[PDB]
Design a binder for this molecule. Sequence first.
Ligand SMILES: *[C@H]1O[C@H](CO)[C@@H](O)[C@H](O)[C@@H]1O
Ligand SMILES: *[C@@H]1OC[C@H](O)[C@@H](O)[C@@H]1O
Lengths: 4, 323
Amino acid sequence: XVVX
Amino acid sequence: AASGVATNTPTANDEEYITPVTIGGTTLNLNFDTGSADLWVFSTELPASQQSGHSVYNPSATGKELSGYTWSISYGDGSSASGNVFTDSVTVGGVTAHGQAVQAAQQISAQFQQDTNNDGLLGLAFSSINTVQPQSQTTFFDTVKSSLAQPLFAVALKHQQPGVYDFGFIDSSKYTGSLTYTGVDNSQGFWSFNVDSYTAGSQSGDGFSGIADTGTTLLLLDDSVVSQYYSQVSGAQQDSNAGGYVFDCSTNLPDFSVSISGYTATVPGSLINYGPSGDGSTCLGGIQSNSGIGFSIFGDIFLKSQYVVFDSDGPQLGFAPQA
Ligand SMILES: *[C@H]1O[C@H](CO)[C@@H](O)[C@H](O)[C@@H]1O
Ligand SMILES: *[C@@H]1OC[C@H](O)[C@@H](O)[C@@H]1O
């Protein structure tokens, strides 16, 4: 997997 | 003065790190994210079917509603969530924030609906980017910082082992040597810093800026750097099924380092092997493209090698190799  | 330690635990392949947080008496497993400033949780206002497999917050039990306030956020991977807001007591590692804004989810995108490992996010970026309207709210850290012994938090994320979030104090037993500090530019609400140069195995290049982000799984760099790195990995190829460059699991990977205010932060090649691509028999690389955004994302792959201090005084970031 994720990319906040 | 207050201080506390919250223990984090990585999910499969260290895709994310979760930590328990008690809200109005109910404990939820949240993903602490230094890349956003919203504390949002799965709630009873979501469809019952979406509440399944999660610990959820019931605002009516203990929250104080902020009439007419809403929130809406969109993340870098395309996921999003929105809802309403309540204030409640929030406890992390024994540190309690009274009247902390809790963003109850009313809608969540499929990425969140499929992830049963977490019950929401606790944002740790600067409060300037909190999405609450009409008036933004402070992050848990900003809410309690004046009460901590020191206005900082520190983190040690590990590979398939429990780590910690230290609030209000630095645990010197978590790193080797002394910390090196660098200035932070919080103009865009991130913990952004500059690197003076990088070394990708046998190639070195000029500097750039990036953000320290516990909420991003990989180390996302410019395509030029990714190319340079994988040009040195025998047989590396992009696999859209896996999400980027993959290679034979047995491959010897070069190390990656950045020079920060004179300190060399090195990510050993072994930490760059993220895990099974889940596309046959290759492994996914911990280094992938930042899609052309103009700055790098120092995600978990990078963080697993250091103990990092997020200090609101400056602000600044301190780094040292993990012990
Ligand atoms: C963190 O620091 C506080 C303030 O020194 C202590 O009271 C606490 O036990 C922990 O060491
Ligand atoms: C999580 O909480 C406190 C401790 O420091 C840690 O060891 C534990 O697993």
